[PDB]
């Protein structure tokens, strides 16, 4: 179980960063949970998460800083409203819930950079 995502991303002057998280799957994973973590100065914390039912869109949790769209086995995650304080490594964790067997994957993480006008 390996999940890939961009190594580094530049947030536009508006403050909009986007990255895809595509994951390896045995095949036909009806339910999948995507979970984005922010690695700050030596600490990791969940900033957003969402379940992914096959044949339809995502369903993020309220107050999630992310919004995304599905496409087979990959989600196109975009986060808005960023400034220099939010610059860090955004790791995405993906796990196959149903049907079993259960798998768990964590990527290297997308290092999002931001600077304020």
């Amino acid at each position, epitope marked *: 179980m390996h999940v890939a995502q961009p190594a580094v991303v530049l947030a536009s002057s508006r403050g909009i960063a986007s990255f895809v998280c595509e994951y390896a799957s*045995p*095949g036909k994973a009806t339910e999948v949970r995507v979970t984005v973590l922010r690695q700050a100065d030596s600490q990791v914390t969940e900033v957003c998460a969402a379940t992914y039912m096959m044949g339809n869109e995502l369903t993020f949790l309220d107050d999630s800083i992310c919004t995304g769209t599905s496409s087979g086995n990959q989600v196109n995650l975009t986060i808005q409203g960023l400034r220099a304080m939010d610059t860090g490594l955004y790791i995405c964790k993906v796990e196959l819930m149903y049907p*079993p*067997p259960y*798998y*768990l994957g*964590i990527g290297n993480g997308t290092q999002i950079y931001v600077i304020d006008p």
Partner: antibody
Amino acid sequence: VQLQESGPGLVKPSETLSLTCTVSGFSLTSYGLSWIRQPPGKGLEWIGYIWYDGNTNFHSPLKSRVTISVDTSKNQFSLKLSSVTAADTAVYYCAKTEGHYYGSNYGYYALDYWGQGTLVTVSS
Amino acid sequence: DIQMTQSPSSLSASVGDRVTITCRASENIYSNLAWYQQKQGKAPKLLLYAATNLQDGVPSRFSGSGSGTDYTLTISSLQPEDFATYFCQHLWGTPYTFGQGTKLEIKR
């Protein structure tokens, strides 16, 4: 931790073969049970599986004929092969299928504990 | 669906030698591979899970390598007790197909 197969050594051709796999140390853990067979002097062949969900969703050359189930009360799983022929003479094993933590990921499954194996020779 | 092929079907090598068993998969399985040892008359015993990670009980002379499709075993300093028929199995797909198996012979 342990498990052993129980089945008749002989079964007549073109009638359903029925096995059982009495187990100990299962449940209280995310377990999965596989069934494997090995004809005489021949390589191993994976048949199917069944998980603690009760899910028996899989595919295999034998999926058409096999019917795996579980009797939770008696702590035994039951494989049932249909319309048997000389090709189905083999040693049938049941084996625990367990996942593993490797680095940040989890999965990397493998047949952890095997049974002794019961040999069944279809013949008239 | 995803088939496995080992080589060689059999081989010989004296005690103390270094021997390797290769096992190539059709598709990519991302190191979801298992190795097994079977001494006839007994059920097979799991040596390596996750391609490289060896099971607690197994000696250290057993070790695995590879990635993607091609994977291997290695027995640095072979012992007479290691006579068996070794099998590789992928567990990344609906049918967990085994390999044909290689028969290791001691040659005393």
